[PDB]
Write a protein that binds this ligand. Structure first.
Ligand SMILES: CCCCCCCCCCCCC/C=C/[C@@H](O)[C@@H](N)CO
Ligand SMILES: CCCCCCCCCCCCC/C=C/[C@@H](O)[C@@H](N)CO
Lengths: 107, 62, 235, 268, 283, 62, 283, 235, 62, 178, 59, 90
C-alpha cells in the first residue's frame, strides 16, 4: 500500500531532500519495485527519477538519488534537488511498479 | 439457395460495390425477415384523382 | 438445429475486437460526403510536418512564448554548447509536446529518421557559422565542440537561405525504440555550437533569437497503439 | 527565369485592385486547394445564386496595426473582418446563406538592421477561449466578432471576476493559441513566417472550408487569421522600436443564396 | 494505390559530395517543410525497408472501443418514498477526456458509430434478501420525441424509437449507427453561433452560446430497469463504449495541451502551465 | 457473396499466401466491420502547401 | 520437403563383415557425433518403420496452454476502511517454472502469443448476504501509458489501450497477440547490460542490472472488478494461461538443472546438488 | 438467426485445444525475422547430439566434476565389470539428466536405437583392449565378461582413433517403452570390461580416465507429451 | 477461402484419404490457429558442425 | 573501432593452443556459448554482478568447484560465482556439448579451432554493453604427467575478429572498467 | 459440433432488429390479396397531398 | 542555373559530416588533381592496405584561432595537424 508522507517545507538556499516512503505490508511483498518520479511540471514527459537496476538520471542535472539500489530493498527512497535556485512548484509525484497490483502510487 | 444483394453504401472508410448474403432457414414465408427492397409509386391516385388529366402550365379550370 | 460447440473467448468483450452488429437505424437516408479540403489518411502525415521546439524550458521561460526562443550573441568564440538535447522524441520535455512527440505518446514503439530545422531570426546585417551535431549513444554526451564535431554533424552558414536542416539518421541497435526514457533503447545526443561566431556591424542588435523545428522523415513509423499520459481526468 | 522571374517578386490582381511585392517568401495555398464555386453535385440551396464577381472579389485593406517590443499578437475572423467592406459586406447581409474563399496578404516591411519574426496562421474553425472561470462558452456575439479592427492575444490568463455584470468576452493566451493548445504546433495549419531579414510579407490563398457546402456567414466564421511574434521586434539599439503591420484581404469565387431584406445585426 | 500496410521506402546507398546543390539549406518562412532524408546530409548504406505505417492509419488509430459515459439506474422496494431511479443521458463524446482528445486532433470527421454496453449491478443495503435476474431497457430518444418522466410511463412503449432489451449476465449489448449528421461531416469545432442578434430586437432574444450549434445535436439515451420494484434494493451501472468505424477526418489540429474545461475550448485558471522545468544546455 | 482476402503474415510457424474469409450478414453498411484495407497518401498538402513546387537540391528562396 | 509427421527411416537388412572400414571407431575431439546406426555394428534384419516425430516438433512440444500467473482482485463493502483491491501484473513467463524451463531449452525465440483467462470467485466472510454476477475488466497497459492508481480512476476508460470485459460464469476469456518484440526475436538470455558505466561520470549513474535489457519489456496487465462496492465482500482470482503459437526457436541449450532463483540464471546455496547416489558398478 | 444446437464440450477450456481467437493488437507492424544461426525444428534433433554421462554417481563423486570420469588402470586382467548400467534412458540416475534423458522426461513413451560413445582420455603411450556390452532383458544381469560376451557387444581397441562407439539396437517386445522404471517395458543391461588390460610403459601414469557419451540414432522417437519431474516450484 | 487438408489417420473404424476443413475468420495472422503442418530438418548443424565433411566408414582423424 | 562506434557486429576464429607430450594425460573441454549469462555471488540479491566484474577483458575469469556466497551485505563483492559442474549458470556441464565445441585430448591433439558467426536477436548491437559469445574452457579429464605430483602446462588462447563491421560513429567511449 | 464463439450483442433484443423466426402456424392456408383501391407505398406520398392550414389559432 | 544554382553557395559531404556555405569564391583543386587511392602500377608495399574510409575520411574541426590588427599569420602541417583526430590519427 502507498503511505507517502512527503508534504515538505522544503527550505531554500538551499538545500534539502525530497523523500518518498512506501511502507510495505506485510505478507504479499512487492516486486519488481522500480521507482519513478514525475514532476508537475511541464511534463512532456520527463524530469524523472527512474530506477530499474542502476539508478537512471532522466535529465535534470541538479539531482541526488539515495536509495540502496542496484540490489533491492524495497523503496523508501529519498531524492534531493540541488541546486541552488528556486526551481519551484508546481509539484512532484512518486510512482512505483509491482508484479502484484502496484504499477501505481500517489502525487 | 443463398440470396446475394447490394448495400446502398453511406459513410465509406479510407478502405466497387459492397454486398450482403441472405439465406432462408424456414419453409414458411412469414418466418422470413423483411427484404426492405421496396418500391416507390407516383402519388397521382391521391394528388390528382381527376377524370381529365391536368397540365400545370395551363388553366386548371377552362 | 446445426450442431455447434462454444470455444474460449465466447461472450467476452474485447475493446479492440472487430465484428459486425445490428443497425439501430435501418434504411436511414445518409447525408453524402462533400470534397472537404485538408483530408488526412495517416497519423504519420502529421508527424512529417515541421513543428516548433520549446528548447528553453527554464524555470522562468517555460510555459510562456519565450521557451521557443534560443538566444544568441555577437560574443567571442567559445567551444561551449548553445543548447544540449537528448534524442528521446516522446519522453524528453523539449520534444514530448511537439506535434511529433504528441503523436508518439499514443504509441509504444518508434522507428526511423528525424530531421531538425533551425531558423535564424536575427537581422540581415548579421553573419555567422554554427555547428549542429548528432552523437549516437554509448559515450560521454558532448559538452564541447571538439567532441560534438567527431560525430554526425552539419556546419550551418548563415545567409540568404534563412534556415538550415540537420537530418538525424535512423541509427539504432533495436528495430524499434520505446516511447519512454529507457537506457536500452537510447537515441543519443543532439547539440548545437558556434563554429566561428555571430558577427554584426555597428547600429545593429548584438543579440538575436533562433527558432528550432522538428519533423519525421519518410522512413519513419510507429506501433503498438496506447493511451497517452499527456492528458487526464482526475475526477 | 534566366529572363528575370523570381519567387520573391510577385504581382497579384483581383478586379480593380493590384498588389506588388519585391520581397516575398513565395505563396501558400491552404491544403493545396484553390478557391472554387459550389458544384452542382455538391450543391444544397435550390435558388439561382448571387455571384458579385469583381464587385466583391477584390482587395480590401483593413486598419493598419502597430508592432512593438510589447505586442503579444493579433487576431481576425472571416468573413467577420470584411463584414463592412463595400459590395462584399452588402451582399453578405442581404442573403441568408453565403460561401467564400480568400487571398490573405499580410504586409510588414522594415530594414536590413531590424530583427523579428511574425508567425502568420490560417486556422479553420478558430474557436477561442472565454474570459470566465465560473461559466463556459459564454462569449457574446458582439465580442466574438470585432469586425475589421480584429482582436488581440494576451501573455497572461486573467479571469473575468465580475459575476454580476460579466465582460462576456475572450481571453486568448498567446502560448496556448488562445484555445487550449500549444502555439509551437500551430504550424500544422496553413501558414507563412514573416522573418524581417528574409521577407516583407505573407500571402495565403484560402479555400472555402466547412462541414457544409454553404452556410450562414453572419452566424458562423469559417477561417481565423492569427498573427503572433515568434521572435520579438528589435532594432539597432532603440529601446522602444515600432513597425506597422498592414493586412489586405480579398474574397474569392464567392457566392450567395436565400435573398431577402437586409440583416441589421446588434454589433454593440 | 499505396496501401497503409505497404513497406516504407528503402534507404539508398549514398557517397561523398562536393557540389553546388544545397539540400541542407532552406527557408521555413515559405510555409513548407524540407523533404530531406538521411542520404541528403550524410553518407548512407543500402537498406531494404520492411517497416509499415499500418497501425498509425486513421481507422487503426481509432479502431478501439472507448468509454464515453457511465449511466446510473436502480430498482428500489415498492415502499420507499423516493422514486424508482431511471437514467437519462444526452449523447456525446465530451463527458470524458481520452476519446475526445483523439477525435480533436482534427476539425471535421465522418463515421459509422459502434455502441457497446457493459452492464454491472450490485446490492446497496446490509440486507440479506435477494433479487431475480434483471432486464434493462436502453431506449434511444431522438430530438423532438417524448422524453420519459417515469421509470414506467407511456413513452417506454417505443413504437417508433429504437430500444435495446438487455439481459443481465449476458454478453455486453451492441448496436451499429450510420453517419447521422445533418451536415456533410461532424464538426469537432464551430467558430460561431446558432442565433443572429438583431438590433431592432431585444438583446436577451438574439442571445446564444458560443461555439454551440443545434441545442440538441443527437437526442438522448433513456435507460431503465424493466423489472417491478423488489423488496431488496439493487443498484445498476451502464458503461457506454463508443467506437468510430469506417471513419474519415479533415483539417488537422494541435492536440489539447491543457485540462478540458466544459464542452468548448475554454481553459481554466491554475491549469495553464503544462510543461516542466528543463535547462537549455542540459541533456 | 463471400469476400476472400490476404493476411499480411507476421511471425510464421515451422509450417504461399494465407487468406481470411469475410461475409456480410446485414443490409446496412453501418452494421459492417472495419476492412482495415486502407490507403496512404502523400503529405504534400500539409508539408509543402506552396504555390510554386519546390526542389530540395536548389535554393528554397530565389 | 521432409514433414514432422513422416515415418522415420527403415532399418535395412545387414550381414557379416570383415573389412578395412571402421564405423565403430572415431574421435569425439573433433566436436562431432558419430552418425552410426544398428546395421553398422551388428547383423540386422529388414524392418519397415512406421514411427514418427510428429509430437516432438517445436510447435507440438509447446502447443499447450501453460499457467504463467495468478492475479488477485476484490470487491469489498463500501464502508470498509481498506481500498477496493485491483490487480497489477508485470507480464512475463518467469513468475512460474514449468513453461519457463521449456522455453529456456533455447537461447532465442519467435511467436504469436495466445492468452487464456480462467476466472474464479468466492466468499470471504462467515456472512450470509449475497452478490450479483461480477464483471471483470482486464486492461493491457503498455510501457509509457498511465498505470491505474484506483479501482475506478480515469485510466480505465481504455480509449487507446486494449481491454477485455469478462463476465463471470462464462467460457474463459481468450485473445491473440502478434510477435511484439522490439528485436528480430525474443531473447531468453542477454549476456550484458542496459547501460555503459562511463569513467568521467559518477559510479551510481552508469549502474544497471546484469542480464537485464528494457527495464519494461512488455508493460503490464491491470485487472479490476467493474461492479460497485457490495455489502458482502467477494474475493476473485484470475489465472493466466500462456500458449506460444506459430513458434520458432534458435541456438539450443542444456535444461535448467537446479532450482530457479529470480529472473536471471542465478543459483542459490543448498540447491546445487540435483543428482542422487548411485554406484559405478550397480545396475 | 440460423438454427443451432449446442453439444457437449461447449464453453469448456481444453489447455491442449487448437482454435482461432480475436487479436488484441490489430494492424500491428510486426518486426521481420533475421536469418539467425542454430535454428531447431524438432526436439529429437537435440537428442541426436552426443552428451556426457555422469557414470560415477557415488556418495562422494556425485554432484561434482568427478561423476563424469570413469577411472581405469594398468592393473592385471580381471573378468569383473568396470561399470554396470541399466537401459532406462529416462529413469536411471546416470542417464535421466543427460540432454537425451532430459527431453525424454517431457514425454511418456520412447522408441528406437541408442548409441554409446566412449572417449579414452589416457596418455598416447598407453595401450589397451576393452569390451563394451549390451544384454537385452529377461536374464541374470551380467557380472562377468563371460556372460556379457554372450550378448550384443563391441571389442574396443585403443589407438589413434581416440573414441569407440557401441550401438544399442532397438530390441523390444512393445512398439514403445515407458519413460519410467517398469518391469514390463525394461530395456536390459549395458556393461563394460577389460578384454585384455590397460598397458603402460615406465615414466607414464598407471591410471587414466575414460569419458562416456550418449545419443539417439535416426530411428529414434518419443510420444505422449507430459510434464517433467526434473524441475519444480514448491511454493 | 476454405483450406482443405489431410488427416494422418491412426486407429481406423470397421468403416481412401480422410480430410478436415479449415477457415480463417480474422484479418490478423496472430489470430489464426496452429497448422501443425511442420517440417523436419537434418541435425547436421549440431551433430557434425565440422569444416571437413566426415565419412562414417573411414577414420575420423587422418 | 569498437569504442569509437555506438554499434558493432563481429564473428570470430577462436584458436585454443595447448601442447604437451606422449607421456602426459588430460582433456580440455573447449566450448563456444551464445549469450553465456553467468551466475552471481549473492544469495540475498540477484542479477547484481557489476559491469566491471562481469567483463574481465583479456585476462578473462575462472570457474570454481564450489559455490560460496558473498556474505558482506554492507559492501558486496558484486561479482560472479560460476561453479564448474553447473557450467557457471544453473545447468549440468555434461550437456554443454549441445553447444559449438571441440575437445583438446592431450593424446590426440595440440589444440581447438572454432569458427564463430555473429549470433543474436538483432542484426547489429552495442558491443560495449553486450557480449554475444562466451568462451568456456574446463578440464573434462584432469591434467596428469608421468609421476610428478604437481605438473603444469600452458594454455594459450589466440583469437581473430571476422567480417566485422561498425555503425553510429562519434567520440571515443571511455568506460569505467575498475 | 462446429466450433463457434459468441460475440457482443448476443442474446439481446433490438426492437429495430431484422431477423428470421419460427412460424407458430405452419402450413397455414393464407387468404390471397384482392386488388383494393387506394394503396400506399410511401408515407411521403401523403405529405404531397394538399391539407388545410389552421391559420387563425387565436384564443 | 536559371533554376537557382551558384558558385558562392556550396554543400560538402564526407562520411557523417556536412559543410554548407552561402558566400564562397568557388573551390580549388591543387594542380587539377583530385585525391585518389594508390594504383597497382604505382604501388610499393606488398601487404593488403588498411582503408578506413568513412571512419577517417570525414571532417575534423581544429581549434579556432583569433584574427586581429596585430596578427602576422598562422601555419599548419599535414598530416601533423590531424594526428590526434579520432580514427584517422589512430
Ligand atoms: C438503442 C441505441 C441507439 C443509439 C442511437 C445513437 C444515435 C446518435 C448518434 C450521434 C453521434 C454523435 C457523434 C459526435 C458528434 C459531435 O462531434 C457533433 N457535435 C459534431 O457535429
Ligand atoms: C487484453 C490483453 C492484452 C495482452 C497484451 C500482451 C502484450 C505483451 C506480450 C509480451 C510477450 C512477452 C513474451 C516473453 C518475452 C521475454 O522472453 C523477453 N524477456 C525476451 O525478449
Amino acid at each position: 500500500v502507498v503511505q507517502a508522507p512527503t508534504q515538505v517545507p522544503g527550505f531554500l538556499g538551499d538545500s534539502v531532500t525530497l523523500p518518498c516512503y512506501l511502507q510495505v505490508p506485510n505478507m504479499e511483498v512487492t516486486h519488481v519495485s522500480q521507482l519513478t518520479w514525475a514532476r508537475h511540471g511541464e511534463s512532456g514527459s520527463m524530469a524523472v527519477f527512474h530506477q530499474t537496476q542502476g539508478p537512471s538520471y532522466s535529465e535534470s542535472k541538479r539531482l541526488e538519488f539515495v536509495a540502496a539500489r542496484l540490489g533491492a530493498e524495497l523503496r523508501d527512497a529519498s531524492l534531493r534537488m540541488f541546486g541552488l535556485r528556486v526551481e519551484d512548484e508546481g509539484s512532484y509525484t512518486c510512482l512505483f511498479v509491482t508484479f502484484p497490483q502496484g504499477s501505481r502510487s500517489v502525487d | 439457395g443463398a440470396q446475394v444483394s447490394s448495400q446502398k453504401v453511406g459513410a465509406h472508410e479510407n478502405s466497387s460495390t459492397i454486398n450482403y448474403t441472405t439465406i432462408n432457414y424456414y419453409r414458411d414465408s412469414a418466418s422470413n425477415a423483411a427484404s426492405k427492397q421496396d418500391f416507390s409509386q407516383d402519388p397521382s391516385k391521391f394528388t390528382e384523382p381527376i377524370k381529365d388529366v391536368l397540365i400545370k402550365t395551363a388553366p386548371m379550370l377552362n | 438445429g446445426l450442431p455447434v460447440m462454444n470455444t474460449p473467448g465466447s461472450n467476452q468483450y474485447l475493446t479492440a475486437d472487430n465484428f459486425q452488429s445490428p443497425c439501430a437505424l435501418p434504411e436511414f437516408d445518409v447525408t453524402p460526403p462533400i470534397d472537404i479540403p485538408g483530408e488526412v489518411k495517416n497519423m504519420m502525415e502529421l508527424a512529417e510536418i515541421d513543428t516548433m521546439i520549446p528548447f528553453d524550458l527554464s524555470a522562468t521561460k517555460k510555459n510562456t512564448m519565450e521557451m521557443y526562443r534560443v538566444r544568441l550573441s555577437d560574443k567571442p568564440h567559445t567551444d561551449d554548447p548553445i543548447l544540449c538535447l537528448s534524442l528521446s522524441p516522446a519522453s524528453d520535455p523539449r520534444l514530448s509536446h511537439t506535434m511529433l512527440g504528441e503523436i508518439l505518446n499514443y504509441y509504444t514503439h518508434w522507428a526511423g529518421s528525424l530531421k531538425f530545422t533551425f531558423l535564424f531570426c536575427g537581422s540581415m546585417m548579421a553573419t555567422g557559422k554554427l555547428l549542429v551535431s548528432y552523437a549516437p549513444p554509448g559515450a560521454d554526451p558532448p559538452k564541447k565542440r571538439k567532441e560534438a564535431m567527431l560525430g554526425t554533424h552539419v556546419i550551418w552558414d548563415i545567409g540568404l537561405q534563412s534556415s538550415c536542416t540537420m537530418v538525424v539518421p535512423w541509427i539504432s541497435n533495436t528495430t524499434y525504440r520505446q516511447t519512454i526514457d529507457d537506457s536500452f533503447t537510447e537515441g543519443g545526443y543532439i547539440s548545437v555550437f558556434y563554429q566561428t561566431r555571430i558577427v554584426v556591424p555597428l547600429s545593429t542588435p548584438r543579440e538575436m533569437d533562433i527558432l528550432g523545428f522538428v519533423s519525421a522523415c519518410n522512413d519513419f513509423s510507429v506501433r503498438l497503439l496506447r493511451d497517452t499520459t499527456h492528458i487526464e481526468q482526475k475526477a | 527565369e534566366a529572363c528575370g522571374y523570381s519567387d520573391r517578386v510577385l504581382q497579384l490582381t483581383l478586379g480593380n485592385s493590384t498588389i506588388t511585392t519585391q520581397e516575398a517568401a513565395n505563396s501558400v495555398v491552404a491544403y493545396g486547394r484553390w478557391p472554387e464555386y459550389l458544384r452542382d453535385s455538391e450543391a444544397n440551396p435550390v435558388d439561382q445564386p448571387t455571384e458579385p464577381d469583381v464587385a466583391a472579389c477584390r482587395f480590401y485593406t483593413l486598419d493598419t496595426v502597430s508592432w512593438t517590443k510589447e505586442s503579444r499578437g493579433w487576431w481576425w475572423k472571416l468573413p467577420d473582418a470584411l463584414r463592412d467592406m463595400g459590395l462584399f459586406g452588402q451582399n453578405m447581409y442581404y442573403h441568408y446563406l453565403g460561401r467564400s474563399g480568400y487571398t490573405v496578404h499580410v504586409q510588414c516591411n522594415a530594414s536590413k538592421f531590424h530583427q523579428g519574426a511574425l508567425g502568420v496562421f490560417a486556422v479553420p474553425e478558430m474557436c477561442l477561449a472565454g474570459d470566465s472561470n465560473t461559466t463556459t462558452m459564454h462569449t457574446s456575439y458582439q465580442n466574438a466578432n470585432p469586425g475589421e479592427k480584429g482582436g488581440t492575444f494576451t501573455g497572461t490568463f486573467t479571469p473575468d471576476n465580475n459575476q454580476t455584470s460579466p465582460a462576456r468576452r475572450f481571453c486568448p493566451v498567446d502560448y496556448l493559441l488562445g484555445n487550449g493548445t500549444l502555439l509551437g504546433n500551430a504550424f500544422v495549419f496553413p501558414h507563412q513566417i514573416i522573418n524581417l531579414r528574409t521577407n516583407n510579407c505573407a500571402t495565403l490563398v484560402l479555400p472555402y472550408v466547412n462541414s457544409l457546402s454553404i452556410d450562414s456567414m453572419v452566424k458562423h466564421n469559417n477561417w481565423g487569421i492569427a498573427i503572433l511574434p515568434l521572435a520579438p521586434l528589435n532594432f539597432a539599439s532603440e529601446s522602444s522600436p515600432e513597425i506597422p503591420i498592414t493586412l489586405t484581404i480579398a474574397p474569392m469565387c464567392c457566392e450567395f443564396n436565400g435573398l431577402r431584406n437586409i440583416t441589421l445585426p446588434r454589433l454593440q | 494505390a499505396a496501401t497503409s500496410r505497404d513497406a516504407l521506402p528503402n534507404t539508398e546507398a549514398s557517397g561523398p559530395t562536393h557540389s553546388k546543390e544545397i539540400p541542407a539549406l532552406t527557408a521555413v518562412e515559405t510555409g513548407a517543410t524540407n523533404p530531406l532524408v538521411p542520404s541528403d546530409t550524410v553518407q548512407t548504406r543500402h537498406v531494404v525497408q520492411h517497416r509499415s505505417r499500418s497501425e498509425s492509419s486513421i481507422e487503426s488509430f481509432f479502431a478501439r472501443g472507448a468509454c464515453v459515459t457511465i449511466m446510473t439506474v436502480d430498482n428500489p422496494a415498492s415502499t420507499t418514498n423516493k422514486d424508482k431511479l431511471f437514467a437519462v443521458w444526452k449523447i456525446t463524446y465530451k463527458d470524458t477526456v481520452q476519446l475526445r482528445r483523439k477525435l480533436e486532433f482534427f476539425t471535421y470527421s465522418r463515421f459509422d458509430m459502434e455502441l457497446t454496453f457493459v452492464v454491472t449491478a450490485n446490492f446497496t443495503e446490509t440486507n440479506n434478501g435477494h433479487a431475480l435476474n434483471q432486464v434493462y431497457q436502453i431506449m434511444y430518444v431522438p430530438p423532438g420525441a417524448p422524453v420519459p418522466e417515469k421509470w414506467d410511463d407511456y413513452t417506454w412503449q417505443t413504437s417508433s424509437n429504437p430500444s435495446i432489451f438487455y439481459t443481465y449476465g449476458t454478453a455486453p449489448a451492441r448496436i451499429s449507427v450510420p453517419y447521422v449528421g445533418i451536415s456533410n461531416a461532424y464538426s469537432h469545432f464551430y467558430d460561431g453561433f446558432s442565433k443572429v442578434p438583431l438590433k431592432d430586437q431585444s438583446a436577451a432574444l438574439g442571445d446564444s452560446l458560443y461555439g454551440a450549434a443545434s441545442l440538441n445535436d443527437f437526442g438522448i439515451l433513456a435507460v431503465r430497469v424493466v423489472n417491478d420494484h423488489n423488496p431488496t434494493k439493487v443498484t445498476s451501472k451502464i458503461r457506454v463504449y463508443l467506437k468510430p468505424k469506417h471513419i474519415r477526418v479533415w483539417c488537422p489540429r494541435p492536440p489539447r495541451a491543457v485540462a478540458y474545461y466544459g464542452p468548448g475550448v475554454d481553459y481554466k485558471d491554475g491549469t495553464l502551465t503544462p510543461l516542466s522545468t528543463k535547462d537549455l544546455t542540459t541533456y
